Amino acid sequence: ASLTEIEHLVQSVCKSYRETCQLRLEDLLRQRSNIFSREEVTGYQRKSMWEMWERCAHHLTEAIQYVVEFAKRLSGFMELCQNDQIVLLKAGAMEVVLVRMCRAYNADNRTVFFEGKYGGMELFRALGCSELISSIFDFSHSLSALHFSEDEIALYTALVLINAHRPGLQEKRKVEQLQYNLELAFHHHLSKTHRQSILAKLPPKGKLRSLCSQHVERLQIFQHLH
Numbered sequence: 001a002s003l004t005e006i007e008h009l010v011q012s013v014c015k016s017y018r019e020t021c022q023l024r025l026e027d028l029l030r031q032r033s034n035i036f037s038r039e040e041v042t043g044y045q046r047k048s049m050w051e052m053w054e055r056c057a058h059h060l061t062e063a064i065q066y067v068v069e070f071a072k073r074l075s076g077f078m079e080l081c082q083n084d085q086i087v088l089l090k091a092g093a094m095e096v097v098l099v100r101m102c103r104a105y106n107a108d109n110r111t112v113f114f115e116g117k118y119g120g121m122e123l124f125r126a127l128g129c130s131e132l133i134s135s136i137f138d139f140s141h142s143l144s145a146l147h148f149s150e151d152e153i154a155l156y157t158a159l160v161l162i163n164a165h166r167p168g169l170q171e172k173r174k175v176e177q178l179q180y181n182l183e184l185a186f187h188h189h190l191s192k193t194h195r196q197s198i199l200a201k202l203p204p205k206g207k208l209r210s211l212c213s214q215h216v217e218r219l220q221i222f223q224h225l226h
């Protein structure tokens, strides 16, 4: 891929992201003043773990579907064999969802957009896993400090997804190639926007992976229990 071919990769990634981002950034920013009251928060805390688990499962189900659609629009993701597509989505989809959260997150008051309004982690008290919820918020807090642009989120989420170290791939070398192409594409774009300094600030890959595994473990405790 030459100059025009790396810039085309950039833009196709930004395209998929734009067409699949679920919630527009301007809407999310405009809504930051729209915050759950004390009665509404208490209304959420009083709900059973089961109903709360139900609303979160639906939220996480809807968010994951847009991520699946993001994948399917990625130049070269289709060219991968169907088996490998599945291995990537299985291991990465929820990780991308975790990253995507930072846009719906207000570091000013440590709140997140949920079901029409902004609220803190104490919204989710009834689930009984604040340590995990607080990790997710902290993760989103430290990402929100980098002020990711829409494009950087596009490229970075592509790279969360396209990872050749996912256990059980069949065409591992072809997944490696695409990954290498996106890495360069991302690095180039950062150089054109004078944003290279974020690279040293990007979390250790094992942070996401570790947080997500902990998230899936609780999710499986939930799925079996209800």
Ligand SMILES: CCOC(=O)[C@H](C)N(C(=O)c1cccs1)c1c(C)cccc1Cl
Binding pocket: 055, 056, 057, 059, 060, 097, 098, 101, 112, 113, 114, 124, 127, 132, 133, 136, 137, 215, 218, 219
């Ligand atoms: C493991 C069970 O706990 C959750 O489902 C929690 C409530 N939760 C999440 O797990 C999320 C994980 C990734 C994006 S949201 C979440 C939701 C659904 C909306 C807003 C903020 C968060 Cl942190």
